[PDB]
Every structure is written in structure tokens, then in C-alpha cells.
Structure 1
Amino acid sequence: FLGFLGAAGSTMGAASMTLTVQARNLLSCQQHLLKLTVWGIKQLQARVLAVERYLRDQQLLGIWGCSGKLICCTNVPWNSSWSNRNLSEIWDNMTWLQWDKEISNYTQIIYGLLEESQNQQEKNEQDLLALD
């Protein structure tokens, strides 16, 4: 908790340097909870949900071939229709909150393409003469 959100106003490029700050903070009595068994449930539900959300994101990175990475490259080309901007307009002079608002509607298109790309890559690994 030394920047949980310190990069929020930074540009997209600059904010790429705090990815471990946000990730490490996303998976952070005695008798009362059992004597009054309403609160034991209220507390467990909050804990179970934090775990399920964490795992769903990890499963996607696994499927897309980005497991274990905070920054990962793929082979899906960027469609100009998703955002008609060049790199100097995206990485500089723009925040991640603004970018998310701009992309939002295309999130599922992009995710579907990332999954298709990884499956094609695996098919090419079961053919010993691949990519030649």
C-alpha cells in the first residue's frame, strides 16, 4: 500500500512501471462470528469472491499464453477501427482510465481473438516442420 493507485493520473506509458504495485495489493472476531452466524457468512463471502476474481484473471492469462507475465506480447494485429490513433497519442498524453473508456466496446472482440491466436500457435507445434 505505497501507491495502490498512485499512477492513476499518469500517462499510459509512465503507469506501466507500477504494475507490481497494483498486482500485489489485489489478494491482501474470534468467537463473535460463530456466536452470531450471519457474520461468519458475510465475511466468508467477501473472501471467496476475492479469490474467484483473482483466479479468473489468471486463467485468461494462461489461455492467451501470457502466464507469469505482467507485460505480454501477442500476435493479434491491432485493428485501426478499434482506435484510430498512432502510438504517440496513446502512450503519451493519455491515462489508462481514458483508454479504457475508449476501448470498452471492443473488449470482447479482442479477447476472442487472443484465444484464437493461441490455439493456432499450439496447432503449429504438433508439426515438426512448422513455420518453415
Structure 2
Amino acid sequence: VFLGFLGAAGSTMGAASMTLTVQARNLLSGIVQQLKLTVWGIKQLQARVLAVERYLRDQQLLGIWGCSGKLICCTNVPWNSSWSNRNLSEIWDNMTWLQWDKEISNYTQIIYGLLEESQNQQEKNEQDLLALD
């Protein structure tokens, strides 16, 4: 369904689970076009550099959690329940993304580290192992 930019903000997470691209497109705004010092000129350029910098930070994060085939990354290792344990219906029948981030805001830096370290290192050097026969 064509919601639009943030169009699924007022929807359960599984609802927004289909409209991901619409936000991604707005990460350059195309034509933007945005002359001496020119107040609003420095602003224009500082804006664009901020935008690409922002974009590249997270694209880097995804490079690290090596998927690049984004919107979905899935492996076969279980998940830790300690971090605000909740039910399936408590998420998909009871929560939208907004309310969800309020609760998950604590464990982010934790999760970043192990998704970074564990799979990258394990999937590493096994390709090195199978590069023999």
C-alpha cells in the first residue's frame, strides 16, 4: 500500500514491514541544488555533506554487519531473551515501531558489538577453510 514517507509510522511494525524503500529514497532528494560566502550557501553545502555523512555512517554499519542485501539479515543462531522479554503478540499485535524503540533504546550499543564481531569472525576464515578443496 502506497503510504509514503514515514507513511507507516502509525502502524504496527509488521505493517511498516513492507514500506521500507520509501524512506530510503528520500536520502538524497535529487535535484536539491542546495556565489560567495552567501548565508544559506555554507548552509547548503554543510547540509549536503551532513546528509551523505549520515548516510554513510549507517551504510558502513551495514557493511560491517555484512549483508548489503538489506532490509533483512537472518542466520540460524538463537537470540538473547534477557533484553526486555516480550511476546510476539506484544510486538506485532500490540506495538508500532515508535513505541518499540522507546523500549529497545538501551541495548543498542550492546547488539551492535556482537552482530559486528560474532558473525563476521565466524563466517570469516571458514571461506579461508573452503578455499582449499
TM-score range with shorter-chain normalisation?
0.7 to 0.9
Q: Which residue matches 1:36?
A: 37
Q: CA deviation at 1:121?
A: 2.4
More deviation in 43-52 or 114-123? 114-123
Q: Identify the structure with the greater helix proportion.
A: 1
- The unaligned stretches of length 5 or more in structure 2 are none
d(CA) in 2 for partners of 1:49 and 1:87?
A: 37
Q: Deviation string for 1:77-127 (max 9, x for gaps)?
A: 422121211222212221001110000010000000100123322334245
CA contact (8 A) 2:65 2:116 kept: yes
Question: Are residues 31 and 13 of structure 1, via their aligned partners in 2, closer, same or farther at CA, if it must alter by over 3 Å?
Answer: closer
CA contact (8 A) 2:13 2:97 kept: yes
CA contact (8 A) 1:63 1:118 kept: no
Q: Which residue matches 2:57?
A: 56
CA contact (8 A) 1:7 1:15 kept: yes
CA contact (8 A) 2:3 2:19 kept: no
Question: Are residues 114 and 130 of structure 1, via their aligned partners in 2, closer, same or farther at CA, if it must alter by over 3 Å?
Answer: farther
d(CA) in 2 for partners of 1:10 and 1:31?
A: 30
Q: Which residue matches 1:69?
A: 70
- The unaligned stretches of length 5 or more in structure 1 are none
CA contact (8 A) 2:9 2:98 kept: yes
What TM-score, normalized by structure 2, do the two folds share? 0.82
Question: Are residues 8 and 71 of structure 1, via their aligned partners in 2, closer, same or farther at CA, if it must alter by over 3 Å?
Answer: same
Q: Deviation string for 1:67-86 (max 9, x for gaps)?
A: 13122224564221212112
Report the number of matched residues.
132
Question: Are residues 127 and 81 of structure 1, via their aligned partners in 2, closer, same or farther at CA, if it must alter by over 3 Å?
Answer: same
Q: Which consecutive segments of 4 or more residues in structure 1 shift more than 4 A?
A: 29-33, 129-132
Q: Over aligned residue pairs, what C-alpha RMSD do you find? A: 3.8
